[PDB]
Amino acid sequence: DALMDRDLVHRQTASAVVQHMSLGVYGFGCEDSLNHLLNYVWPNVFETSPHVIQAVMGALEGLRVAIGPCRMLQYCLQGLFHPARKVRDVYWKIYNSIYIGSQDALIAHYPRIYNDDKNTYIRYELDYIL
Amino acid sequence: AKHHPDLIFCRKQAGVAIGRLCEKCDGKCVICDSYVRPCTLVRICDECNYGSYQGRCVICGGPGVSDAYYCKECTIQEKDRDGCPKIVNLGSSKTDLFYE
Amino acid sequence: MFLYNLTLQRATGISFAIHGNFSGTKQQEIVVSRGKILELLRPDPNTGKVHTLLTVEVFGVIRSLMAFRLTGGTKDYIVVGSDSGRIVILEYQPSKNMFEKIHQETFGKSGCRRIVPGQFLAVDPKGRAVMISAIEKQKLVYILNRDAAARLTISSPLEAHKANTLVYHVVGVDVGFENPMFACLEMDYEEADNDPTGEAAANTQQTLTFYELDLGLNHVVRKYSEPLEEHGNFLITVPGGSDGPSGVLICSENYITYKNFGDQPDIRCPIPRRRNDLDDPERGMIFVCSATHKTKSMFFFLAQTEQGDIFKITLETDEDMVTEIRLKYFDTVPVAAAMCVLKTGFLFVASEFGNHYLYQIAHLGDDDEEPEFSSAMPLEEGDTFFFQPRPLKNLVLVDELDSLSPILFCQIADLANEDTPQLYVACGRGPRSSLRVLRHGLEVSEMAVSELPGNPNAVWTVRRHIEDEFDAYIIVSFVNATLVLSIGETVEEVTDSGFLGTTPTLSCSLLGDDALVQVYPDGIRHIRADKRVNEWKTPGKKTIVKCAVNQRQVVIALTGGELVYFEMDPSGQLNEYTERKEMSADVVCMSLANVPPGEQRSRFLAVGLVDNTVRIISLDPSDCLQPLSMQALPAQPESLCIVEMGGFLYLNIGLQNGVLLRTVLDPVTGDLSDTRTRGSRPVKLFRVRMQGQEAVLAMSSRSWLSYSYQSRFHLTPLSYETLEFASGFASEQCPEGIVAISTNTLRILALEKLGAVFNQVAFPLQYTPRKFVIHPESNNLIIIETDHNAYTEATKAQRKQQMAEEMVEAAGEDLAAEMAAAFLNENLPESIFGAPKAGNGQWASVIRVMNPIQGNTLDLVQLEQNEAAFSVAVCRFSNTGEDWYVLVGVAKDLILNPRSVAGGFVYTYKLVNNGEKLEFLHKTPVEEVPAAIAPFQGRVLIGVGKLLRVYDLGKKKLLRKCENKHIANYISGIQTIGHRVIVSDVQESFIWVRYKRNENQLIIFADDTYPRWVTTASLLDYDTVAGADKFGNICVVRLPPNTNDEVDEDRGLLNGASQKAEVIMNYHVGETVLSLQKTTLIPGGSESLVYTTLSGGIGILVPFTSHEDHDFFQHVEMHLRSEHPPLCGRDHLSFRSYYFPVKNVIDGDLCEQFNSMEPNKQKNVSEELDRTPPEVSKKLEDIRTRYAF
RNA sequence: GUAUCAAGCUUACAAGUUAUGUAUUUACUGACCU
RNA sequence: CGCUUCUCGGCCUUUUGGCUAAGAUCAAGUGUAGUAUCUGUUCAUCAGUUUAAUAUCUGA
Ligand SMILES: [Zn+2]
Ligand SMILES: [Zn+2]
Ligand SMILES: [Zn+2]
Ligand SMILES: [Zn+2]
């Protein structure tokens, strides 16, 4: 209801709550409610005020570890090359924060990118089996 | 700090120099600026801890009293294993108050 | 839901190994890294064997491991760099037996990144500086010093930043009291990425760069940077100063290179190949090892290539300038990742896959017969210097260190009709592969055998004196036969010897120096050389029950209990005491023990009674015949034992179902009885001697040896049947052993391997054992063997015939046809000399039907050159009768990089008659590799890759019935449970498919949200599905409660199915789990998931009974995260949440490090949890006793 | 100002329409600050 | 059928009373960084700049 509320102050305080909660229940098996609340945190990325954007950025970098970098990367996808620059640069810097926060955890979390006419975009090493 | 966005950190390589905090900023975290759950000592570079800059607080630059710490929230987010978080600049805070 | 991790056999594959004086003495020790496990090994030189002294879990990956010697110091210190950004320096303390964390320092963020260091490591050999290095952009230098407490000090990390620059391998240059230099291979790639022409990325050759640390100016500067016309992989330190020409050696494809700056030119030597070996279409040849050695007169390098050919590299310089380099063929070994050559003639080779080896250097130097060449002699046309491989002349096989890595496929099966199940494990790579059967017992080996008739009850062991080793006589009695055999050669019944008394004998012992006390119906014998017997023992009638034996004092009883002693005098003959209790009988058994000091009685009496009671009494002349402490037992003991196993007197009663383990102490008795279970015949607890100490064998339906291996209480069984008795044995035929038979025979047993748990027995193989299945009727195994870059033996014979053809064809007019026929008739063992390698794109494969009992080639079916097997399953169809069928998935022209297959086949086999041979039935084509076979409802389901197809038998070929195309990229495994089909994607996750009975449709109805790169799978319940990945995670996905199966078939929910499943646990191990199986490991225990990893580690996941156990072990691991941090600096919660976050899983391997700390931390954790550390240890080992081994 | 619980005193008696730009407030946030 | 008067109800000021000297007296806050919202206010056809697409300029 706080993230559903019309004012942005409720949403930035609730993002602080979800941040401190994600830093509190890390490693306990409470990823369902955090995935519920991040579905309401994620439309609040588009705000341009500095306090609410640093609050939701702290919430994203706190939820990066608790539910896993995989859900964060899936939330980042189909928003990287979006033609509107205002969503584009913000989603790229969220991807930069996730990249510097946990790089190797994203290695199992990348999707597949098929080949073009010239280059080789397939990670052939993870493709075969024994 | 997160309170004043115009402050920038030093972000160079951290050595064995243990950071200090003044009597006004005792217990404060450097990144999240909190009071609870200390986990990791603060390591700063040799350029920010040299000569007259020894025994000096990280944020305000006053005389240090207690040791500086990281929080567990900065520990599990690994904001302690980055560059040295020594605040270098001082702008629009504790400067114009001297002129007033 | 709530699972608990416990390892049984830990990791065995070695990634890094180092040698040095870690204990601080003259002898050298080995420190190896198993990836996750850090181990210390001691090569005991007198016997040649290897004894592991300490093994620890660092809870991370060890990316860099290197030891250094301090300047003016004796003990070598360890530098470990890991996935975390915590570089750690370690010192082995021999007193407390733990790796002391000397200094842990932060240098960057964690994880196996490209940016942060940890990947490569170098150190100055004098011990002044150490460089840790990443792949790119940063290399950090620590300065090592010592202050006046003889203590190590480390300054700030120096910077060597160089953007857009790769790092290939870093090494340290030995300088004598000069500024230390670090050599590394670097490569710039900004002109390779900014230029799209492609040729700029071809002339971007390697540059060897020297970094000089000015300790006077406190910075790192790029001193030299010289290019390479070849591409090198790693470097070799050359010792110098006052020792020789200080420099670096550069290994490269078909070349070895010396460079050293200033005036010495680039000395190049081509690498010698074999004579006409069939592995070189266009391939190169590199090294894998360096193995530097300094014998205090010269220095050499025992380098190793990727085939196992050891090269003796020796530098000989007339001036300070280098003249030329030279090398020669030394020996052949299995291929190793790292060597550790040792002082006093030892060489430890740590293979990348399979068992490790320790050889003894028999002939060093070897400059007598071998025609070796050099570099600077004018040789043209390639390398031009070949060699013929040869068997062992310089090294001899001494130790074969057992290693289950690589575990590629595993099954828990009871094929051998044992009470406990067995592990069938695929292992090895290529020619060194083996199917290994694993039991729970110990390695009991037989040396001799006899044919003792009748029905013997027992066998007793006695020596001449306390100091000898021959153990002159060995007596066997049942009621009335004496039968005191000679222990040595020609085992046969005896005449009247110097120790023999009468025939109905019942006990023997050595009481005095040579005085033997022997017990029979007319009881007392006291015989050393004169037969000084005093056979009174008459309180009227009763004379035969209940002997008991100690070496200094005697207790014997009659119908009764607490009775006579019948000691000896220290300078005379026997005596007696007249103080009797007379004990309304109730007697079952007696057993005691004695201490080696003591001029007194100096023991403790233990008696067991017919009623539910035992009684232990100290019988000192003060407080004599007065009971000390009381008892409790449920049914009846029927056995006793007292033992001392440490370096607290370990009382052991045992009952007909279970055994106990008390901790009796000498003034006061705090028992604290540990409990364990064992038809269930009454047990027998007998004292034997191994390794220098003593131990207990408690015997039941099967035997159970309880020995203290550095205060851990290993109660491991024996591999044989029930043997009804146990007694010690010592002779020159075998030094220590156990004669243990009361059933119609006689054997000599030996316990060679004692520190481990499992019994490795290996069956050799030819190629890589991909997977196998289990034939339930007349139990056999059907295995598929598949190697990329390998030939089949028909193609090998054709290639050898071609070699002979061009050797007799190329200028044979001048002739040697003996060389061609000599190459033909001499077939080299590929397991020793290395398997040949078939270029690129070839796929050798065979199918092997094997009896798992004897391990013979019962059936072998070969394939052609480009045909590889990937999936096999036995099944019984529904349209036909009872006869079995084998479906084999074969691929042709698969070529891996880049992947472009050219269609595959499915073979069908009949398996006549009982499973001893295998007949071909038909061969159907398919467009993509069938890497999954699954029997289901009397038919087969095959995952072609994006296509799941249900098949049926046809007399010409297989006929499909359905086809599904909405499944993702490529199929990796299909397992069935009934009415549901679990489809493993190779990339994303599991997919639930419903097969219809009225229709034939394959309709997907459920999927998962996380990409995982799933490899193997297992089924636990009707809804829960477990799985593992290539990376090391173990995941369990559980469906929502509704999940309606009846879905008849365009929008999906998120680009797929609609019923999204949830995950109840994600877990990280660090090693690729390739076999998950839900089973029960012991009879009487409970179900537990068994996972077998890739690097030899075997673990289990255990469910919790109630919530209080989950809460208690969660508090235990939460306290041990804070009190006992890991060694590499990697956080335990961050390591178990490495890729995916941990969920409701307690790592019990961290919890079992509670018993390794000092009692201060144990007292703190136990008083925080309001318990005692014995109670916490008992609650900890209840899970391993009930659910595990 | 109230609802309970004794002594003080009292007869000892009668007796079967979204939106922009700016002049311009009002509120809100950052544990902002001698 | 219309008209005058009376009674009953549906109801649109009810504030604690009135008077003495309106009965007598009272009510301080910053400085920094940023944001939301009111009042005031105003919104002719090619080519390219720019923008996710739109909305300033030059052109006849
Ligand atoms: Zn301060
Ligand atoms: Zn903090
Ligand atoms: Zn600094
Ligand atoms: Zn203009």
Curated annotation (Swiss-Prot), chain A:
PTM comment: Phosphorylated. Phosphorylation occurs concomitantly with the splicing catalytic steps.
Disulfide bonds: none
Recorded superkingdom: Eukaryota
Stretches for region Interaction with SF3B3 and SF3B5: 74-130
Site (Interaction with SF3B3): E31
Quaternary structure annotation from Swiss-Prot or TrEMBL: Component of the 17S U2 SnRNP complex, a ribonucleoprotein complex that contains small nuclear RNA (snRNA) U2 and a number of specific proteins. Part of the SF3B subcomplex of the 17S U2 SnRNP complex. SF3B associates with the splicing subcomplex SF3A and a 12S RNA unit to form the U2 small nuclear ribonucleoproteins complex (U2 snRNP). Within the SF3B complex, interacts directly (via HEAT domain) with SF3B3, SF3B5, SF3B6 and (via HEAT domain) with PHF5A. The SF3B subcomplex interacts with U2AF2. Identified in the spliceosome C complex.
Name of the protein this chain belongs to: Splicing factor 3B subunit 1
Species of the source: Homo sapiens
Swiss-Prot record, chain B:
InterPro entries the UniProt entry points to: PHF5
Modified sites of kind N6-acetyllysine: K2
Residues noted as binding Zn(2+) 3 in the record, renumbered to the chain: C29, C32, C71, C74
Localization in the cell: Nucleus; Nucleus speckle
Residues with PTM Phosphoserine: S93
Region annotation (Interaction with SF3B3) ranges: 78-81
Binding of Zn(2+) 2, residues: C22, C25, C57, C60
Chain segments carrying region Interaction with SF3B1 and SF3B3: 34-50
Domain of life (superkingdom): Eukaryota
Protein name: PHD finger-like domain-containing protein 5A
Native organism: Homo sapiens
Gene: PHF5A
Swiss-Prot record, chain C:
Modified residues (Phosphothreonine): T1172
Chain intervals for the UniProt region annotation (Interaction with SF3B5): 1072-1095
Annotated spans, Interaction with SF3B1: 1009-1030
Keywords (A to Z) from UniProt: mRNA processing, mRNA splicing, Nucleus, Phosphoprotein, Spliceosome
Subcellular location: Nucleus
Protein origin, superkingdom: Eukaryota
One Gene Ontology term from the biological process aspect of the record: positive regulation of DNA-templated transcription
Region (Interaction with PHF5A, SF3B1 and SF3B5): 105-119, 145-168
Site label Interaction with SF3B5, positions: G284, E306, E352, R429, N897
Region of interest called Interaction with SF3B1 and SF3B5, as start-end residue ranges on this chain: 193-231, 770-788
Residues with PTM Phosphoserine: S156
Marked site: Interaction with SF3B1: N969, K1143
Protein family per UniProt: Belongs to the RSE1 family.
Function of the protein: Component of the 17S U2 SnRNP complex of the spliceosome, a large ribonucleoprotein complex that removes introns from transcribed pre-mRNAs. The 17S U2 SnRNP complex (1) directly participates in early spliceosome assembly and (2) mediates recognition of the intron branch site during pre-mRNA splicing by promoting the selection of the pre-mRNA branch-site adenosine, the nucleophile for the first step of splicing.
Subunit structure: Component of the 17S U2 SnRNP complex, a ribonucleoprotein complex that contains small nuclear RNA (snRNA) U2 and a number of specific proteins. Part of the SF3B subcomplex of the 17S U2 SnRNP complex. SF3B associates with the splicing subcomplex SF3A and a 12S RNA unit to form the U2 small nuclear ribonucleoproteins complex (U2 snRNP). Within the SF3B subcomplex, interacts directly with SF3B1 (via HEAT domain), SF3B5 and PHF5A. Identified in the spliceosome A complex; remains associated with the spliceosome throughout the splicing process. Component of the spliceosome B complex.
Domain observations: The core of the protein consists of three beta-propeller domains.
Protein name according to UniProt: Splicing factor 3B subunit 3
Protein's organism: Homo sapiens (Human)
Phylogenetic classification of the source organism: Eukaryota, Metazoa, Chordata, Craniata, Vertebrata
